[PDB]
């Protein structure tokens, strides 16, 4: 799909409380950190004899992932996020559609 | 190789005609529906006889073909090729299905039985009702004795019981012999190559003037 | 080894053992789902009305 | 049950590979695309390509 790099939308930043200009970028997961309770517990469980203790997913079935937008307000510098349907191809910088021209 | 006709004698299922959903059928064994001097005028063959049904069954296409052939053969050889007009009044539009079944010795190792037993088309048939006409013949009054038994000789090719009737009508028209005769006495009867048109009291008067001139020419 | 898939047999009898009695009716039915803009008015309408009757019969 | 045994050549390296699996295992099927480029003047060991 194609999504513009800017968008004007409601910003609940306690100072805007109205439609404002928002910069948009694609959300990405972010590196998983150690010392989280989950990782610490999982490592504790794996230590010692017994082998693999937690289930490991294999039956992958879905090909795509839902895309999530990261909105940045130009005034209050607060971040809001919203999602879209599934899509195989995604893109911010978009050459707009042109009708009259040929193939 | 043909499954005996007793397996499809009665109307057990809804009509299953060729269409955009059927799309794969054989061809009807019958192709000819009008026999004899089919260009004869309406007034050439006054007498008309019908082969009517006394049953609610399905008549196979090749059964119709065989009766057609036998009747035409007899009429042409005996009464002459230009003494009668034959018209069959049914068409094979119902497709018959079959579940062709493995018939070898030891096929049970492969047959899979009744699972997924939707049939395949192999034949066409026509659905008839009690009182519905199958065959129709129009001739001269002098040829009735030949025709009536020609049909009687033909009835043996269809399954079930079928009567033979002498219609009180003129030719293939929907009018009685005298009432039609007087209507052609006046001018409102004007024939075509095989059938005839009639003047009506309705319509644009100028157009009604254009044809049937004698009816007004009193 | 197949088995009977579905049927509605005997279901009508099963129902009719205990009558299809209508649920009930009441005065002053619930205002759940009605126009809240109308509710907000009505609650003050009664608020004033009771005060009026109280002062009138005082 | 029917078990699949198949032989397949590597697209890029050219080496020959094979395996066998029961007819249910869903191994990943890659996505490819033939893209019809034009070749410009050849510089140093790089190439030089051309879209439409």
């Amino acid at each position: 799909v194609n999504v513009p790099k800017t968008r004007k939308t409601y910003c609940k930043g306690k100072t805007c409380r109205k439609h404002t200009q928002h910069k948009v970028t694609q959300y990405k997961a972010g590196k998983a950190s150690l010392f989280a309770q989950g990782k610490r517990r999982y490592d504790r469980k794996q230590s010692g004899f017994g082998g693999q203790t937690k289930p490991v997913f294999h039956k992958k079935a879905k090909t795509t992932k839902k895309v999530v937008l990261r909105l940045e307000c130009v005034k209050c510098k607060t971040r809001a996020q919203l999602t879209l349907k599934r899509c195989k191809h995604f893109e911010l910088g978009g050459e707009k559609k042109q009708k009259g021209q040929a193939l | 190789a043909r499954r005996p006709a007793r397996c499809y004698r009665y109307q057990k299922n809804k009509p299953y005609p060729k269409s955009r959903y059927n799309r794969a059928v054989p061809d009807s064994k019958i192709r000819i529906y009008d026999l004899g001097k089919k260009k004869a005028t309406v007034d050439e063959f006054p007498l008309c006889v019908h082969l009517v049904s006394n049953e609610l069954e399905q008549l196979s296409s090749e059964a119709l073909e065989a009766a057609r052939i036998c009747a035409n053969k007899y009429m042409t050889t005996v009464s002459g090729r230009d003494a009668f007009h034959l018209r069959v009044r049914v068409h094979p539009f119902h497709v018959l299905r079959i579940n062709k079944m493995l018939s070898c010795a030891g096929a049970d190792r492969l047959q899979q039985g009744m699972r997924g037993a939707w049939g395949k088309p192999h034949g066409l048939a026509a659905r008839v009702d009690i009182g519905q006409i199958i065959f129709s013949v129009r001739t001269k009054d002098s040829n009735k004795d030949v025709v009536v038994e020609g049909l009687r000789r033909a009835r043996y090719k269809f399954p079930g019981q079928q009567k033979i009737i002498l219609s009180k009508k003129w030719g293939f028209t929907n009018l009685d012999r005298p009432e039609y005769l007087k209507k052609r006495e006046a001018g409102e009867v004007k024939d075509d190559g095989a059938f005839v048109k009639f003047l009506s009291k309705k319509g644009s008067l100028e157009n009604n003037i254009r044809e049937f001139p004698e009816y007004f020419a009193a | 080894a197949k088995s009977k898939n579905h049927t509605a047999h005997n279901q009508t009898r099963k129902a009719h053992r205990n009558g299809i009695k209508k649920p009930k009716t009441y005065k002053y039915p619930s205002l759940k789902g009605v126009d809240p803009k109308f509710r907000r008015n009505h609650k003050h309408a009664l608020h004033g009305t009771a005060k009026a009757l109280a002062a009138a019969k005082k | 049950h029917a078990k699949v045994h198949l032989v397949a050549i590597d697209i890029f390296t050219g080496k020959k590979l094979e395996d066998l699996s029961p007819s249910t295992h869903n191994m990943e099927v890659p996505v490819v695309k033939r893209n019809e480029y034009q070749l410009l003047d050849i510089d140093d060991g790089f190439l030089s390509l051309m879209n439409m």
């Binding site: - | 009180k168 | 009719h16 649920p23 039915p29 789902g33 | -």
Partner: protein, 159 residues
Amino acid sequence: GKSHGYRSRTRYMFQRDFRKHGAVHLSTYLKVYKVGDIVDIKANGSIQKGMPHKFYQGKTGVVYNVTKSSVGVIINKMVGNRYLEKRLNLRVEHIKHSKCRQEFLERVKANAAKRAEAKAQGVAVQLKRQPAQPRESRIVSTEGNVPQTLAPVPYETFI
């Protein structure tokens, strides 16, 4: 596999009419609905928004809410061994006054008229309706109407 969508088996039920396609006549929007009106439901296939589910076609209920473009309706639905009341929201295009009531309250005001009038002289107004009574006696003359004798008709083929 099976298929039970929101509009399944509605091929003919939502076809509009013959020679009645196009826009809706304004009288529907000129209708006025009060709370407590009893009203039937007949879905209009040309207005996809605010349609009723196919089960409620041809049902009748009671208005309980009025909004800018829709009306809240109460419908009694039989499920299992009882009735449950269902609350709907329907645009006025699938809505038309049930004239059963419109006929009914004419009776109410008519009986009011007869009751007061007959109360003015006390002659037992007799308001209740009665079913079709068995017709009372009468006498029939033959003057200029001498009875005609009939007879069964024989069989003729008539083809």
